[PDB]
Symmetry: C3
Subunit: 336 residues, 3 copies
Amino acid sequence: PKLLYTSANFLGIPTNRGQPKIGTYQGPELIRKSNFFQLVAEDGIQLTDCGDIIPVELNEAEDPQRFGMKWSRSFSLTTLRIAERVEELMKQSNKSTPLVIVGGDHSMATGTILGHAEAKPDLCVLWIDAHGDINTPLNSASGNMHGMPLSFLVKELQDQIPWLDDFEGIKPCLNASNIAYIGLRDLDAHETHDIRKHGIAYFTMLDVDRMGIEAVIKEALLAVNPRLEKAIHLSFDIDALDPLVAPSTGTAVPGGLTLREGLRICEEVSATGKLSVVELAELNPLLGSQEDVLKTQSSAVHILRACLGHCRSGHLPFKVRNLTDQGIMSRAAHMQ
Amino acid sequence: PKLLYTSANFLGIPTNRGQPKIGTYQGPELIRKSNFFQLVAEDGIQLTDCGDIIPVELNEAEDPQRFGMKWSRSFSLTTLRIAERVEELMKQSNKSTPLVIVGGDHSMATGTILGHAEAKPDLCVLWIDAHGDINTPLNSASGNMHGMPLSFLVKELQDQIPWLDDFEGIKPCLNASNIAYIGLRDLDAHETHDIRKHGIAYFTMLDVDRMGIEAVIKEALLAVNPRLEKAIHLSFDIDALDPLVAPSTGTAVPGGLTLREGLRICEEVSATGKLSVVELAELNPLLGSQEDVLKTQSSAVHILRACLGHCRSGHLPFKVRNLTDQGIMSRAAHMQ
Amino acid sequence: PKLLYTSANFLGIPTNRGQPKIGTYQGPELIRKSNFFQLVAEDGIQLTDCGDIIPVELNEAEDPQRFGMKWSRSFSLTTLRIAERVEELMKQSNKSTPLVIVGGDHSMATGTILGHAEAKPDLCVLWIDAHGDINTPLNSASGNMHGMPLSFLVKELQDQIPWLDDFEGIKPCLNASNIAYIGLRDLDAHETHDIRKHGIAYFTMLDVDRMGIEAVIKEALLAVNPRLEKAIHLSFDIDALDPLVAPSTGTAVPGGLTLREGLRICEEVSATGKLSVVELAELNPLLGSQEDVLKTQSSAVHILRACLGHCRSGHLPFKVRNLTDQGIMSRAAHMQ
Ligand SMILES: N=C(NO)NCCC[C@H](N)C(=O)O
Ligand SMILES: N=C(NO)NCCC[C@H](N)C(=O)O
Ligand SMILES: N=C(NO)NCCC[C@H](N)C(=O)O
Ligand SMILES: [Mn+2]
Ligand SMILES: [Mn+2]
Ligand SMILES: [Mn+2]
Ligand SMILES: [Mn+2]
Ligand SMILES: [Mn+2]
Ligand SMILES: [Mn+2]
């Protein structure tokens, strides 16, 4: 049996200061508690747990609202700490060794992409989400950083980002043409404006309905990675999936991707051989019932396994088993 | 941003005498308690709450069984009261101003369509339901009026409707060729007979499975509104949707439309520019768990928003926001 | 109204020694307690309840592990008892009279197919399951017989089956070319090996996603029954369906068939006119909540009804009802 990726790194980022609901910090543990590692090993992949990044969580006095943003300095400091760690992991592995990141609220993506791009400047981004996460600070109704992580990364948007000194090291490292969305269904008006104005490829649930997920995936890859020349940063918000399948998340929106559609995205991205980083955001084990958490954990594990190359059509055994070798009489042998 | 419909009317009809399970009278309140109105406003639509129609609910002595029908005189009197109110609302608005009606059990449709047709005689009807709701009184196993509302409206069926004096003012205002069903999966044998005999266009879940919802919608519109010349009466039974998505309803049937399929129907109907009335029937907040009710409410709100023109691919802002106008330094400006 | 099958037999097989979770023995009762029989009758089908097969359940001392298998002698003895009963039922009915079997864990299939093939040697098998159920004894991680029932039946696999005297009467009666799988998503590596090596037709959830269920069904029938010449043994594991739709089963796997996809398989198999036996395995009413059991029961009933020829597009009445015959005045007659 052949593998596109024989080894992989696992990294937890328990961000929770990007949105007000406590519990996203438990995301990484939700996956470590699962059978994820075991299942990955059974497919013949060597998965190294690289631990957790410690987010910077300032107190209220140190981090007051600035431009309506909540916890903006905890964000800039966390973003830089994340970027350093991801960069160093990606360069140590510069076949290929994918980095699997479990969050944590989606505000971590500013840091993960920043670091990733430092090691791989020509990357593209596939953003799987019910939301755009591209609100610029003055347009955000909530001030929640998890709704803004792309806005700081996109060059074309920098005239709508307020300057802050502590954000200086957060260099916009993405062109609008390097990003493609899949799964959108709850865009804010100003996000819609920016996405259309700057030509960001986007495939909403309407598109998934009309085109089918197979054509959507194909068109998304065509738009930002036409010849599979670029490393892929796959940023997967669990809330992209339907609430029936991933209820334990802070901003659930009805009419999402089926688990199967989610699997198809990850299977195809994996199969390009260009999956460089996959991050899974917005797991919150403190939301919903016990069964809700189990469903969400289960969905997340299947998604992540798909990213690493798990095939639903089965895998071949590494060693084929033979009855005769154990000194055992078969039915065929007995009849002969 | 442009809108097909800039204003709309909202009307509650808390019918509950069309079926035995208490709670459909709470349907209108379930939607008023939601964020429906707020969400409609945020899309730039002016929605006027026109209140509730008071159904006529006679006592047992005044309204005994007649031809097996339960509460048939409460029905005829309610039907006429509804018809008057809907007619007057539709004529006051004779662009275009859609009427959104929340029930209430589906027996209200005899009245809503009667009134609608008085103002718009050439209308067509799109009936989205797991059921035919076209049982004639002697064929009904239950005697529940919510299973008969179309039978009194269809001209071709009048030789199978028993005459009752109090039904005189309920004039059959529909031809069989003006109706198309989507979502059917639990037809009674005599409904199947009448539907096929009189050539009523129907697309069951089997058809949805084999054709896909996109082709079904297209064929349904082709059958009853080929050139978008006619006003559309969209009669949406919440039980058309799968029980996983709308559990809180009295006659739930497995294997229904996904929410997305339901949204596609409403999105396409809305986009014709001919949506004249949409009614949503059979919400029952007294059925199922608290979470069941929330799921059902949520599904209903998304469906109704789609009918009014909400786009899952986003809307443009009415006023585009500019950093410089507030006297704020952007990152781009700072770097220059 | 015409019927492909006017009569049918119903048989319970409460196997529970094929897997460790208590409750599959309650499967047959779960269906008898439903409205299944009534619904089948209302479609005009004569369904005869033929009772239950009593499985042989030895004690621990009489049935120790052999080749890692758990309860292997209870299995061989049960297999032979089942085979005798099914053979005798199929020969008594040698139009056509389908046998409907409700389990019981899937280990019963070795017996049902053995008996079926005795009466109909040229049969084909459609295996609807999340799992291959084709583990050979030394490759099974669990030793659970419900994961091995096909391995004893497939001729090409007999050099990997250990000989046991009490298994002598279990004659391999299937060629690898007579079997087609639909719904696979959790194959063990050695199953994948055997399936590919011996050319067993298989359509996994990946295939369902990429091809659509319509093409999958067509290709599955083409592979093992190209000209509808052969009797069909439809072996339906309830766990083939998504856990959202059939939670009450022992080895549930996310991302399964929708109920509608399951219905389409059974509808098409039924419509060939070659449905000879359908068995439904792995119902376990002792698993999950009360609502979970109700959902699972409901899904099972709809599936079974589809197998017997129930049409979601409706059925014609046997006697058409006429208003005038009862001495009743119609609205049409009154107006004339
Ligand atoms: N992490 C996420 N979505 O994927 N947060 C949701 C953001 C929703 C909303 N637009 C906000 O600005 O807060
Ligand atoms: N409102 C509805 N369906 O949409 N009621 C269901 C009617 C079911 C059944 N045929 C009856 O006559 O009572
Ligand atoms: N009846 C069933 N599946 O349909 N059992 C599941 C078997 C799973 C696993 N391969 C085992 O050998 O035990
Ligand atoms: Mn999101
Ligand atoms: Mn997000
Ligand atoms: Mn209905
Ligand atoms: Mn209805
Ligand atoms: Mn199974
Ligand atoms: Mn099975």
